[PDB]
Amino acid sequence: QVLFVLTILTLISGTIFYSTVEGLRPIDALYFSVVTLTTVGETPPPQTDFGKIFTILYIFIGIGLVFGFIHKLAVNVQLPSILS
Amino acid sequence: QVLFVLTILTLISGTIFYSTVEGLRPIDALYFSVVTLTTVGETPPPQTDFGKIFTILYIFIGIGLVFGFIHKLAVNVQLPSILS
Amino acid sequence: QVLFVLTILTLISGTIFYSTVEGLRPIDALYFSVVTLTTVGETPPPQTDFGKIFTILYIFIGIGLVFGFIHKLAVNVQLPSILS
Amino acid sequence: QVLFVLTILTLISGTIFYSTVEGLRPIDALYFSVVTLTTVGETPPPQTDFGKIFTILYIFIGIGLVFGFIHKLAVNVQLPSILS
Ligand SMILES: [Rb+]
Ligand SMILES: [Rb+]
Ligand SMILES: [Rb+]
């Protein structure tokens, strides 16, 4: 469902934010965004106060969306695929 | 619902704790609190034993509250907004 | 419920393991155990292969228990307390 | 259920990927895979762009599976075992 598009837009947004503000290469910016929203958290934190502030809000807004997608992918695509 | 206020009070509490005990700038203290309670965990750990102890309890008490909020925000605000 | 005791036994176990095997001070060992099982993950990883192996199994066994507790604490203690 | 096998295949896959691409010792590769898919995230991130890209997809595909397993283990094996 739209979940796929909403997640991609969210990651694009994060990728744009962290390339600009934190000065990261897109792939690193997208990486950061992904591991942050999935709560994995394996990179170091944002160095700038604006990066911190954004990440805070990005987490509260982005996580439900990203885990809604991961959820539907699982019990909606992966489950029946496996069961075959 | 009250979830919004309870979460903010919890983050204020964490922000006060980590500024005092760990000696962090508020924004860093609030950052720590947020990434801890959301289980992202991208900063280094608390350096003081009191920081450790507090974080342990702060996690067990704070996480259910913070994820209750993130949950209601998603399936209560974000979902219908998207569906428009 | 027993959840409280099961969680404490699990943390005691982790505290004993990581003091011995990784050579950590109890409080650090307990800290590690807690942030690992809550999936926060803010310390560095175990340095020993036995620490790695144990952590893998400790995560698969411990997490459901620890989040069962955090869950009951929330929708069973915190929720009605707040609603007062 | 198959969950056990699907999880092991997923970790084997991650173990193979990270030994090859990132140049890690199997046990380290498997460790990385496990803490990534459980969202603990305590090691440093992948250093290679291919490691980053793979991890992104590995997270979206692997997490639902790994947490489906952890879930069934809990409310299906651990719960009744405890209740005895
Ligand atoms: Rb996490
Ligand atoms: Rb994490
Ligand atoms: Rb982490």
A10: which chain D residues are within 8 Å (Cβ-Cβ)? none
Q: Which residue of C has its CA nearest to D71?
A: C64
| Contact residues for A72 (Cβ-Cβ < 8 A; gap 6+) | A1, A3
**Residue D14 near residue D33 (C-beta atoms within 8 A):** yes
Element (H, E) at B25: none
Buried b (16+ CB within 10 A) or exposed e, A57-80: ebbbbbbbbbbbbbeebbeeebee
- Verify whether the Cβ–Cβ distance C52 to D28 is below 8 Å: yes
Residue at token pair 């503000």: A21
**Residue A40 near residue D36 (C-beta atoms within 8 A):** yes
| Contact residues for C39 (Cβ-Cβ < 8 A; gap 6+) | A39, B39, B41, C63, D38, D39, D40, D41
Q: How many whole angstroms separate alpha carbon D75 and alpha carbon D80?
A: 8
| Experimental approach | X-ray
- How far away, in angstroms, is C43 Cα from ligand 3 center? 8
CATH number at residue A16: 1.10.287.70
Separation in Å, CA C65 to CA A23, B57, C5, D74 = 41, 17, 10, 7
Q: Which chains touch D (3 or more CB pairs under 8 A)?
A: A, B, C
By three-state DSSP, how is residue B62 classified? helix
**Helix and strand totals (H; E) in chain D:** 4, 0
- Verify whether the Cβ–Cβ distance B35 to A45 is below 8 Å: yes
- CA nearest D61: which of C16, A82, C22? A82
Q: Considering Cα of A4, then A5, then A8, then A10, what sign does the dihedral take?
A: negative
Q: How many whole angstroms separate alpha carbon D70 and alpha carbon C17?
A: 22
* Resolution of this deposited model, Å: 2.5
Tokens of C22: 């990784």
Q: How many whole angstroms separate alpha carbon C34 and alpha carbon C38?
A: 6
Q: How many distinct structural domains can be found in chain A?
A: 1
By three-state DSSP, how is residue D83 classified? coil
**Residue A16 near residue A35 (C-beta atoms within 8 A):** no
The length of chain B is 84
| Residue B42 distance to chain D (closest CA, Å) | 8
B61: which chain C residues are within 8 Å (Cβ-Cβ)? 73, 78
Q: Please compute Rg for chain A using Cα positions.
A: 14
Tokens of B17: 């704790």
Dihedral-angle region of residue C67 (phi above 0 means left; psi in -120 to 50 means alpha; beta otherwise): alpha
Element (H, E) at C4: helix C3-21
Residue A41 belongs to domain spanning:
1-84
Q: How many whole angstroms separate alpha carbon B20 and alpha carbon C11?
A: 27
Which phi and psi angles does A19 have, rounded to 5°? -60, -45
Which phi and psi angles does B83 have, rounded to 5°? -70, 70
**Residue D21 near residue C15 (C-beta atoms within 8 A):** no
Residue at token pair 């990066």: A51
| Contact residues for C80 (Cβ-Cβ < 8 A; gap 6+) | none
Q: How many whole angstroms separate alpha carbon C14 and alpha carbon C66?
A: 12
